[PDB]
Enzyme design. Structure first.
Site, short mmCIF file in Angstrom:
data_model
loop_
_atom_site.label_atom_id
_atom_site.label_comp_id
_atom_site.label_asym_id
_atom_site.label_seq_id
_atom_site.Cartn_x
_atom_site.Cartn_y
_atom_site.Cartn_z
N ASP A 181 0.86 -1.22 0.00
CA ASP A 181 0.00 0.00 0.00
C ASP A 181 0.88 1.25 0.00
O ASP A 181 1.62 1.45 0.99
CB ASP A 181 -0.95 0.03 1.20
CG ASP A 181 -2.00 1.13 1.14
OD1 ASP A 181 -2.09 1.80 0.09
OD2 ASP A 181 -2.72 1.31 2.14
N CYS A 215 -6.35 0.08 -8.39
CA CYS A 215 -5.72 -0.25 -7.09
C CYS A 215 -6.73 0.15 -6.03
O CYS A 215 -7.92 -0.09 -6.28
CB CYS A 215 -4.32 0.35 -7.00
SG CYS A 215 -4.21 2.10 -7.51
N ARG A 221 -0.35 2.93 -7.86
CA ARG A 221 0.08 1.67 -8.51
C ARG A 221 -0.50 1.63 -9.94
O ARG A 221 0.25 1.26 -10.87
CB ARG A 221 -0.33 0.49 -7.61
CG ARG A 221 -0.20 0.79 -6.12
CD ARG A 221 0.61 -0.26 -5.39
NE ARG A 221 0.05 -0.73 -4.13
CZ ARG A 221 -1.13 -1.33 -4.00
NH1 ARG A 221 -1.91 -1.51 -5.05
NH2 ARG A 221 -1.53 -1.75 -2.82
N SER A 222 -1.76 2.04 -10.12
CA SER A 222 -2.44 2.08 -11.44
C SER A 222 -1.68 3.01 -12.39
O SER A 222 -1.51 2.67 -13.58
CB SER A 222 -3.90 2.53 -11.27
OG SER A 222 -4.70 1.58 -10.55
N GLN A 262 1.89 8.56 -6.90
CA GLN A 262 1.50 9.19 -5.60
C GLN A 262 2.73 9.54 -4.75
O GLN A 262 2.54 10.29 -3.75
CB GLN A 262 0.54 8.27 -4.84
CG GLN A 262 -0.93 8.51 -5.18
CD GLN A 262 -1.47 9.77 -4.55
OE1 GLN A 262 -1.55 9.90 -3.33
NE2 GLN A 262 -1.85 10.73 -5.38
#
Ligand SMILES: COc1ccc(NC(=O)CN)cc1
Length: 284
Positions: A181, A215, A221-222, A262
């Site tokens: 995460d 995600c 992650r995407s 991110q």
């Protein structure tokens, strides 16, 4: 500038946080007025992650057409992706409606259902062949046909039926099962292997609707998955890794969905994956 030299220059200077903030500063800002309507509050997982109005996916219904999902259309690469949040308990039927209406052949999942003892997304697919799922709100049926488990990822063959017309289609589910995460994969190797599996399936090809990628929020992650795929494809079209500017590709993708990549570590990993993947494209 060869990205591999830009990479070593940023690494030796430890300036990843500085590059990353420069991208955040130059990124597009477009309205998200539909996402913020009071009727849609229970359709959003995160108050601060919304699709832009210009690029949002519309559901084919008169009642409420809203889903937290964006169309990323990469004109030079000739690839399209839908990026979306992990479905919520009240949006699993909307999720499968979108896959049906957009004619997608693949779903790419980069998270586990549980991370940090909080549900990062709903259990939105069936776990046993003999226990199919019916979505009464959107009139769909979903059945598990077959599952192939490897160490850090699993592939599933699903059957989606439009109960209205009794048409059926085969959907492939590609589940990357070992990505922390707000973290990065164990190695460029496992990520790229996984990527080269989605590509082999036909799921990314222009004969199908856009691949659905998620995600938890559908940006981190995407973001890393679609950025690495597009950069390698651009290399392929011009057979010239020298010509690719990863930062400029990321800003282009941020015209269609906010917040893609991110963290500064996700940006560094994206560079590593493209540099190691290029050692395949140019003929090895
Ligand atoms: C669950 O494992 C499978 C995944 C896909 C298929 N069929 C395909 O056509 C993939 N290109 C069959 C089994």
């Amino acid at each position: 500038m060869e990205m591999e030299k830009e990479f070593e220059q940023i690494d030796k200077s430890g300036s990843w946080a500085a590059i990353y903030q420069d991208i955040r500063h130059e990124a597009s800002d477009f309205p998200s007025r539909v996402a913020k309507l009071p009727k849609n509050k229970n359709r959003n997982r995160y108050r601060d992650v919304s699709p832009f109005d210009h690029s949002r996916i519309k559901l084919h219904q008169e009642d409420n057409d809203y889903i937290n999902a964006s169309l990323i259309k990469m004109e030079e690469a000739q690839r399209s992706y839908i990026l979306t949040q992990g479905p919520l308990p009240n949006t699993v039927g909307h999720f499968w409606e979108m896959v049906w209406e957009q004619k997608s052949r693949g779903v790419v999942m980069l998270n586990r259902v549980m991370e940090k003892g909080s549900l990062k997304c709903a259990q939105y697919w069936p776990q046993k062949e003999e226990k199919e799922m019916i979505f009464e709100d959107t009139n769909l049926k979903l059945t598990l046909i077959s599952e192939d488990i490897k160490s850090y990822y699993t592939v599933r063959q699903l059957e989606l039926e439009n109960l209205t017309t009794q048409e059926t289609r085969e959907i492939l589910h590609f589940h990357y099962t070992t990505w922390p995460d707000f973290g990065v994969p164990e190695s460029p190797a496992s990520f790229l292997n996984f990527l080269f599996k989605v590509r082999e399936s036909g799921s990314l090809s222009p004969e199908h609707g856009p691949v659905v990628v998620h995600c938890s929020a559908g940006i981190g992650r995407s973001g890393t998955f679609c950025l690495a795929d597009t950069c390698l494809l651009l290399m392929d079209k011009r057979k010239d890794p020298s010509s690719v500017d990863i930062k400029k590709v990321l800003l282009e993708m941020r015209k269609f969905r906010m917040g893609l990549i991110q963290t500064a570590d996700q940006l560094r990993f994206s560079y590593l994956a493209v540099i190691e993947g290029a050692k395949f494209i140019m003929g090895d």
